[PDB]
């Protein structure tokens, strides 16, 4: 298919391109570091490397925070965008997300964490005679902290379900998703999510919809964990017996802990 990126240019060194944004269509599976090195390297050849910088963030650029003498490139991965109702060839809309908190930082506690979905509309639609298209419109939508948590859950749940039920089996992928689901040792684990968002039943009715949605994501999530656990029992090597025991122990503890919260 292809990989898309928002690309925008800042500083008077860019002449006509200053402040212009495009969506670039890259081949196959292109990763951030590759398009970034391409663009920074190209402009380094045109301007000289000392004058070229990659903006390392997707937030709207504030020119006053920029060295006026340099040429800045903002590069952001985007995916083709469909409204939730649409979710259930010709591509004019693309979206990137950026994490933010109301306290002014990109990341915060679970209860602080928002996400901004920035929707870009291109001047023309892909597929297109050139490899990039000008951005003609930009809209911003926000997800509140519980909504961010809902997505984190749904997306992990689907990943786990696929890892579990794929044929032929891939035990490595199953174990990776599953250990990271019921066994996290680096990140905090999903229990914390339930404790924050589901522990109290909100008074506000608008908030009740999200509360109920998240509750239902937890049902689906823990269900898929159990399926993951029983499935893995069949895939493991004798060497992995103690590994499996732990995963089962982790699942049971999480299951029992969530139970009171999933009923409410």
């Amino acid at each position: 298919f292809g990989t898309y990126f928002r690309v925008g240019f800042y500083g008077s060194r860019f002449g006509d391109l200053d402040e212009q944004e495009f969506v670039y269509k890259e081949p196959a599976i292109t990763k951030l570091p590759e398009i970034s090195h391409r663009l920074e390297g190209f402009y380094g050849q045109c301007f000289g490397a000392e004058f070229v910088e990659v903006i390392k963030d997707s937030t709207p650029v504030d020119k006053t925070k920029l060295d006026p003498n340099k040429a800045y490139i903002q590069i952001t991965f985007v995916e083709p965008y469909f409204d939730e109702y649409e979710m259930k060839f010709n591509l004019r809309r693309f979206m990137y997300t950026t994490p933010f908190t109301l306290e002014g930082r990109p990341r915060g506690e679970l209860h602080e964490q928002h996400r901004r979905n920035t929707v870009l509309t291109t001047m023309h639609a892909f597929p297109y005679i050139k490899t990039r298209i000008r951005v003609s419109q930009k809209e911003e939508f926000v997800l509140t902290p519980i909504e961010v948590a809902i997505e984190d859950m749904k997306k992990k749940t689907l990943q786990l379900a696929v890892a579990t039920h794929q044929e032929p089996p891939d035990a490595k992928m199953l174990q990776m998703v599953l250990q990271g689901s019921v066994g996290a040792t680096v990140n905090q684990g999903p229990l914390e999510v339930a404790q924050v968002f589901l522990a109290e039943i909100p008074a506000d009715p608008k908030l009740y919809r999200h509360h109920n949605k998240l509750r239902l994501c937890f049902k689906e999530f823990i269900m898929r964990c159990g399926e993951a656990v029983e499935k893995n029992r069949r895939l493991i090597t004798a060497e992995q017996r103690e590994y499996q025991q732990e995963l089962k122990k982790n699942y049971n503890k999480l299951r029992d802990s969530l139970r009171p919260m999933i009923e409410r």
């Binding site: 990763k31 951030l32 570091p33 952001t76 994490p99 984190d152 990776m176 250990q179 684990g189 590994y243």
Partner: protein, 178 residues
Amino acid sequence: MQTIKCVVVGDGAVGKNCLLISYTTNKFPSEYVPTVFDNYAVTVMIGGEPYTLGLFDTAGQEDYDRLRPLSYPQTDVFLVCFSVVSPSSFENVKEKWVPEITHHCPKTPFLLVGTQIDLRDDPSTIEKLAKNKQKPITPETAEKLARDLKAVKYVECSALTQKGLKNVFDEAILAALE
């Protein structure tokens, strides 16, 4: 073929998680969406062939000394990580990480991965280390260490600048395929 199992180890706070989540999501460090979940899957193309990497993120702390190796069986390749601005993390490659993974998986290939290379050539960082009676780890010494400990090779990267980041995972896959 199937998922290549890549276990990622090294001292806490060397930027292991940051580089895994950045690369696998196509995001710079300040824009990555936080998650309460561990590890990362990524599909990468090398010579027009897709390959899938399962990246197992691990907790380096001693509290996990008993639990961590439970993930070691069936590992295809290890990444042994240290920060080029943390001599302690580099010394731990020698005294902790290489011995640990080679004790569990004596035949399994591993790479040495230096991180935070964007800080290494910054004069103020060098000077801050100098005041603490330290110096950063040069590619030459890490390369020598890699050869001395029989790592498949030495690679380095910056999660921030993205420099060498694609290459770290390519070499992991190449090491696992043989």
